[PDB]
Structures are given as structure tokens and as C-alpha cells.
Design a protein around this nucleic acid. Structure first.
Ligand SMILES: [Mg+2]
Ligand SMILES: [Mg+2]
Ligand SMILES: [Mg+2]
Ligand SMILES: [Mg+2]
Ligand SMILES: [Mg+2]
Ligand SMILES: [Zn+2]
Lengths: 115, 30, 86, 100, 201
RNA sequence: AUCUUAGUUCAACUUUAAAUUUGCCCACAGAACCAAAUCCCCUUGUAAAUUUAACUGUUAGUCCAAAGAGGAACAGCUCUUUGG
RNA sequence: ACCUCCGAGGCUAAGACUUCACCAGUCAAAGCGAAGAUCCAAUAACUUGACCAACGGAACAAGUUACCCUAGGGCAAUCCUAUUCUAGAGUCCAUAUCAACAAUAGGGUUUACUGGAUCAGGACAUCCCGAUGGUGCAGCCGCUAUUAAAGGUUCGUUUGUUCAACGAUUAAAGUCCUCGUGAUCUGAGUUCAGACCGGAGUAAUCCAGGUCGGUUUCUAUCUACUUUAUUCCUCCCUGUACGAAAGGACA
């Protein structure tokens, strides 16, 4: 029959060849995921429609932020083929109570202040 | 030798074996 | 249509995304005083503001969770020393 | 027919609630888990259900089991599953009734 | 080891049409047993008694017991076939019983030839008889088998294609397992239905 | 279930109004002697779920992927199941 | 599942389970005492039974409608054929012929526990005519094989699941698709009321039987359309070549 898929953990094991291929690092991982939907929930089982409805990814591309904790990754490992995950980058730090209304997210995934 | 669903066809096409090109052609070099 | 190139150069894929075209004020008065901003700009400022507030809130919660774990490890690893006396 | 578990591990089961309905003895009764004539397992004492693996020592009064254990090598043992209910509340408390 | 059209002791219970015993990689009786030439089945098919008899008659014509011999690996036909003879429409009760049949899977040896013989007599007659069998097959020797298998391993290893069926299937990459079967996870995209594509790594 | 399968009643699903607080997803643990997965919950992402009052309407659908049983492993074949 | 294999007809009380409804059904701590439905009839009663086995059950009802009427619905296991190994034969030899099994191909098998007239369009898997190869035809004709669809492809006796047989011919009396063609015409049917014979039945009536008889009407609105030489025989050439004698050619 057709059933949920339990992905073996072996795939989610970055190698020494993958690390220098994307801008990441084993130690000191990244706080937040910026996730976008690039595929339709239609034509896919209901246990993916519901997940997408839960992560706030209902609309199309429209990026949305989530924690990088396993409780959410378990959800993103089910919808990993209908989304693009990039790591949010903060090369100027979290904004203060000033500069909340003057932020901007660039296509490279960096949140910055005053454009 | 029945036909395959189309998406299985695309999967079979994209994953098709690609052989490593030899460094030199044997005809013009041992 | 060069969305691939635009994203390869840190620009928005869609020239109507974020850029000088879409967010600078489309007009001013003749004298020089600026114009009441456009609805689209207000809505984009609001949504970016909400995005930033969510970012700071989630990051704060995760850091506070790490600190709470540190505290619990202290008060369970060290309070066992109080049973190592007398 | 529905001969299967009806309260799974880590469930709060009150007195008399059926833990498991079975045909053969798949799950043997344990602490505070009683059996009926139809081999249903029910919770004698209010608490939390757990499942464990233990050693099996049948009644000598029974015959189909007392002899098979007699056919086993040195150092052998029949392990089997059990379902217990760790009770939650205490039996009772003492309260002031009269100050005389 | 001579066989008969139907088993002398047929199964009393009318077994259903079990077809999952042919659409996979042969696991039992894959390797030689003190032989030099044999037939390897590149597909998976049912052999009736007629196929077995024709195989035996064709091999017998090039036998000299003092030099070479051939022994059969396949068992006797032991699977019922339900008649439902002509004159009926669909449905209305299970039919009668026809002669029993034997299964064979891909990468299986039907009959192994042993002895110190010449390497071209096989290309003389066993090529013909392999072309005769109801499924894809070939006449193979020890050296040729080793060559083919090691080259298959090399192709699976020295593949410059970043993606293979393993990775895309196991990880459920493009929601792909919606259009595959669980057996695909273990067949590795090489046994579509009852066939066997060898050129896929 | 029905002198019943050209229909009805009950359930399941749907709708409205109202009350309340947990509902869904879910790792670790756990479910027998004789492969896909399933069940169950702490957290987590969410905002829904249960209960009550009141009605109607639909019900034994087609195709595709998959696992089975019947007709070959076919007859574009009857049926069950997971999904679309 | 009319898929796969077999049998049966002490009382009180927290909590729960269930045959996907309900109705039924099931387990049970403690406590007290002893060790297949409803309705009906007989009943003081304590309660009680058969049928309801079509086993969610009309209290009691069968066979049949060819005289019927109304409301409605309507990529073949077993196989046929050709190409592949020649392997078996053929007075020697597989290839001059069959060519067994199998394999690769294109095609169907529904019953038991629709022709004829009229006009015909089309394919070639060619019956004739045409061109060519081999031959074991030493030669016309024969045999097979390639190519060829411009043309042609008869008349009758008996009979109508539609074929088959038979007579005379012919250069030939081809295999199929479009009953091809019934608002062009006709016949048989199979299924219209009449009647008879045979089979089944208590009877009505049935019968995938055999006979005789028996009514389908149309003024053309729209499309479309209404002026695109073959064969045979006779004779010269004669009985040369071919031919082992014998027979007997092309152009
Ligand atoms: Mg839970
Ligand atoms: Mg029930
Ligand atoms: Mg008691
Ligand atoms: Mg009834
Ligand atoms: Mg009933
Ligand atoms: Zn060269």
C-alpha cells in the first residue's frame, strides 16, 4: 500500500564534503530556519497538507521563520520536498526595540536594518 | 514489458548511468 | 527575465520585489514636501516588522531555554553533593 | 472480534477497566491485573499501566505447562510478557474527626 | 532426478495465484556447485513441463558421459494452475486444475554443466537452448560470470551521475514513493515487474 | 438491518446556535508465542477539539500508484485495503 | 466474497469492553449469603413453549402468462496461422520439400454443470494477366520465391445460421474491410396473434424442436453528389534454340 515514509537517519548526516559545499558549520549551528513553499499541497497526502497548514506555509513562496529544534525538524522531514529551507543569517545582530520597523530580509537570507 | 507511469519514467531517465570519460582515446594513444 | 542572475547577485528575483523601484515614493508634491505613503509600502513595513518581532521572540525563547537547561543541570548535578556530606 | 490491547503503556486506568481482551494468553496478568473466565485482563487498582518481561513459573495444578518446563535444558527459562498497574493514589488518609 | 507432468502428491488446499515469488532477485541457488558452464536466467518466468522436457532433449544431443555432464538445479513443477476452461464468462467459481509449473527468477541457474570440455560446444547448442527458454537467459561460464559481475560492481561504483535510484528512493526525494512500490526500496530500480534491466546501476 | 439492493431507518459525514477545555502532529518507552507500516503518548508547530440543543441532505461512484484474492502471472475482468 | 477448508441449535454492585447503528452480547473489584425479538394464548404463581431455520421474525398464500396491460431501465491459460536451431527424413545431402516440439510474431473460443438484388469504395496477405530469381521444369506447363492492385474475377440443379454438393465452362471463377448498401427494393428469420405433430408437465402452460398461413409508413429541410481497353483464339515467323531421346522457344 501507500504509507507514510520513515526516512532513515543516515541521510541526515552532513559529510566533510557537504560542509564546504554549503555555507554551514557542524559546530555552532544556526538559530532559525527561513522556509518557503515551492510546491503544491494538492496531489499530496493529507498528512502533508496538515503539516503545511501547521507550519504557516499555506501561501506560496512567502517566507516564514521557525526554530531549528528537532521538534520542528521532525515536521520538516515530512514536507522536505515541498519546501526550501535556508538558514537565517544575522550579520548585524537581533534588532532592538528600535529598528524593528526598519528591517529587511535579502534574498541571501540575511536580516538587516534600514535596507 | 508494460509501460511505466510518467514520473517513474522521468526518474529512470534522470538516474541513468553516465560512464567516466577516459582520459585519452585508445585509438590515438595506448 | 534574469531571475537566476538576479539571485546570483544578491538581488530579488522579481524587480517588483524589494528595490528602488517598488519602495521609493512614487511621487512628491510640486513644492517639494513628500506625499502620504502608499498602501503597499505600509503593508510591507507592517509585515516586515512582524517578521522581525517573530525572529527576536523565537531567538529569545531558544536562548532562555538553553539557560534554563544550564540551571537544571547545575541544580541536579551539584545538589547531589549535599548528599555527600555528614 | 477486537481481541487486542485497549489500554496501552502509560495510560491511567481506573478500577475494573479492561486492559486487554485476548484469545490465548498473549499477555499474562501481573501486579493488580486480574483475569476473567474469558482471559480478559482488567485493572484491579487505580493507577498507570506498564508492560514488562518476566520469568514464567506455572501452577503445578496445571498440567500442560508444568511438564513443558520439565522439558528444557540446564539454564533454561520461559520468559513471558506481563501487564501491571502501578497504583497512583494511596489507600487513604487520616483527618481530624473529633477534638475531645 | 527425472520429473513428471504433475506432482504425485498434489496439495489438497487450492493455493491462490502467488506471483510475488517471481518478481525479485533470486536468492537461493544463485551460485555454481562444482561446475564450469551453465545457463543464467536474465528474467523471471514459469517453466512448464514441456519446457523442461525440451531442454532435456536438446541437451541430450551433445552428451558424452566420460567427458562432460549436466545436473539440474530447478525442482519439479509444484504450483497449481487453475483451468476455468472455455465456455464461461468472468466470475462464477474457481476452476479446475491444470498441470503444475515451476518458477524461476532473474539471476538464477536452471541447469549447470560440469566437466573438462571445450568452450565452444556451449556456444553451439546451449546458446540455442537458452534462446528456446520462455524467459530471457544466457549461456555463461565461470570466467564470464566473474567478468560480468565485477563489471556490474564497477559500473555501480564508478558512476559519475550524482543521483542514483538508491538515493532518490530511500530518502523519498521528490515525493517519489507516491509512485513506487515498497519493493522498489530493496530491488533498487532493477526489477520492474517480472523483468530485470541490467544496464541500470 | 430490511419480501431489501430503483427505497427506507440508524449510524458516519455535513450545517447552524451554545457551553467548556484541550484536540491534531509527535520523538523515547511500550503492544506473541505462532515487508511497507500501524497503535499510544511528554514536548514542539499550531487552534482547534469535545459536549449540548436543532434540523435536513449524501450513502453502496469513476480513474491513477501500490499490496492482495478471482479470471494467466491476460482478457482493460469481480472484489478488499492505503493514498491521490 | 457463489474466495479458499470444517461444526453447533445464588443475590446485589464501582468500573468497563462489543461484532463499526440500534436490539441484543461480554468481563467484573468490593458487599451479602451457600460451598431466535414483540404480540398472543395455559397459567394464582414461581413464569412457559412450538413455529418464527427466508434464523431482525408478514399469525395463516403455490405453478404460470406465446393473449397480457401500465410505470420505467437497457496484448488468450487452451488455441489458429507465418519466421527463427536445423534435427528427422527425403535412393547420397536440411535448404528442391514437409519441417516435429518449442520460441517471436498478428488474430478468437457464449454456453453446459442475417441472406439476395442494385451500385459498388478500398487493402494485398495475388486467382488470372504483367516483370524477375532458382529449380530436382534438362522445355510449354509444374514447383516454390520477389515484384505488381491499372483491369477482370461466368452461368446453372437441390437448399436457405446463411454454407455445401453437383453440371458445364473459363485466363480466373482470389482472401478480407466498408448485411458495405432495407428514408433503393426484396426474402428468411428469432421473438406477432390461427392451427397441427413430437418432448415436459395434475392443469394452465412451457419448448434456446418440425410443419402450413400471416401489414412497417415517409411530400427530401441540411450536407454530399448529378459530363475525371483488356483478354483469348488462329495463323505466319518453325516445328530452331532448349533438349540426354522424346517434345518443342523467343522478338
Ligand atoms: Mg502523546
Ligand atoms: Mg455494536
Ligand atoms: Mg465477590
Ligand atoms: Mg426475510
Ligand atoms: Mg436477514
Ligand atoms: Zn585514431
Amino acid at each position: 500500500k501507500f504509507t507514510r515514509s520513515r526516512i532513515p537517519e543516515k541521510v541526515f548526516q552532513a559529510s566533510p564534503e557537504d560542509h564546504e559545499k554549503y555555507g554551514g558549520d557542524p559546530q555552532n549551528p544556526h538559530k532559525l530556519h527561513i522556509v518557503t513553499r515551492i510546491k503544491s499541497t494538492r496531489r499530496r497526502p493529507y498528512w502533508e497538507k496538515d503539516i503545511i497548514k501547521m507550519l504557516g506555509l499555506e501561501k506560496a513562496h512567502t517566507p516564514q521563520v521557525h526554530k531549528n529544534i528537532p521538534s520542528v525538524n521532525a515536521k520538516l522531514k515530512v514536507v522536505k520536498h515541498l519546501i526550501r529551507i535556508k538558514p537565517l543569517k544575522l550579520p548585524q545582530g537581533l534588532p532592538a526595540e528600535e529598528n524593528m520597523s526598519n528591517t529587511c530580509l535579502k534574498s541571501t537570507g540575511e536580516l538587516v536594518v534600514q535596507w | 514489458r508494460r509501460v511505466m507511469h510518467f514520473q517513474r519514467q522521468k526518474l529512470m531517465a534522470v538516474t541513468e548511468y553516465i560512464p567516466p570519460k577516459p582520459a585519452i582515446h585508445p585509438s590515438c594513444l595506448p | 527575465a534574469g531571475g537566476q542572475w538576479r539571485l546570483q547577485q544578491g538581488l530579488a528575483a522579481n524587480p517588483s520585489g524589494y528595490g528602488p523601484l517598488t519602495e521609493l515614493p512614487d511621487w512628491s508634491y510640486a513644492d517639494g514636501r513628500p506625499a502620504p505613503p502608499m498602501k503597499g509600502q505600509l503593508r510591507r513595513k507592517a509585515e516586515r516588522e512582524t517578521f522581525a518581532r517573530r525572529v527576536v521572540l523565537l531567538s529569545q525563547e531558544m536562548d532562555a531555554g538553553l539557560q534554563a537547561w544550564q540551571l537544571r543541570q547545575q541544580k541536579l548535578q551539584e545538589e547531589q553533593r549535599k548528599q555527600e556530606n555528614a | 472480534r477486537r481481541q487486542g490491547i485497549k489500554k496501552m503503556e502509560g495510560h491511567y486506568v481506573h478500577a475494573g477497566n479492561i486492559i486487554a481482551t485476548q484469545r490465548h494468553f498473549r499477555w499474562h496478568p501481573g501486579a493488580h491485573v486480574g483475569v476473567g473466565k474469558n482471559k480478559c485482563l482488567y485493572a484491579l487498582e487505580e493507577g498507570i499501566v506498564r508492560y514488562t518481561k518476566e520469568v514464567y513459573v506455572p501452577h503445578p495444578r496445571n498440567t500442560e505447562a508444568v511438564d513443558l518446563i520439565t522439558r528444557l535444558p540446564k539454564g533454561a527459562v520461559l520468559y513471558k510478557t506481563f501487564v501491571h498497574v502501578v497504583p497512583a493514589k494511596p489507600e487513604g488518609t487520616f483527618k481530624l474527626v473529633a477534638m475531645l | 532426478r527425472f520429473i513428471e507432468r504433475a506432482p504425485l502428491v498434489p496439495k489438497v488446499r487450492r493455493e491462490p495465484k502467488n506471483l510475488s515469488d517471481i518478481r525479485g532477485p533470486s536468492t537461493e541457488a544463485t551460485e555454481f556447485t562444482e561446475g564450469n558452464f551453465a545457463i543464467l536466467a536474465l528474467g523471471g518466468g514459469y517453466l512448464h513441463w514441456g519446457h523442461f522436457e525440451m531442454m532435456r532433449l536438446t541437451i541430450n544431443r551433445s552428451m558424452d558421459p566420460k567427458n562432460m555432464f549436466a545436473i539440474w538445479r530447478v525442482p519439479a513443477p509444484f504450483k497449481p494452475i487453475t483451468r476455468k476452461s472455455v465456455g464461461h464468462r468472468m466470475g462464477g467459481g474457481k476452476g479446475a486444475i491444470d498441470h503444475y509449473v515451476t518458477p524461476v527468477k532473474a539471476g538464477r541457474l536452471v541447469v549447470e554443466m560440469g566437466g573438462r570440455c571445450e568452450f565452444e560446444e556451449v556456444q553451439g547448442f546451449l546458446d540455442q537452448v537458452a534462446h528456446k527458454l520462455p524467459f530471457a537467459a544466457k549461456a555463461v561460464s565461470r570466467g564470464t560470470l566473474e567478468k560480468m559481475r565485477k563489471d556490474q560492481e564497477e559500473r555501480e561504483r564508478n558512476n559519475q551521475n550524482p543521483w542514483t535510484f538508491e538515493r532518490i528512493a530511500t530518502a523519498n526525494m521528490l515525493g517519489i514513493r507516491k509512485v513506487l512500490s515498497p519493493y522498489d526500496l530493496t530491488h533498487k530500480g532493477k526489477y520492474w515487474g517480472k523483468f530485470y534491466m541490467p544496464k541500470r546501476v
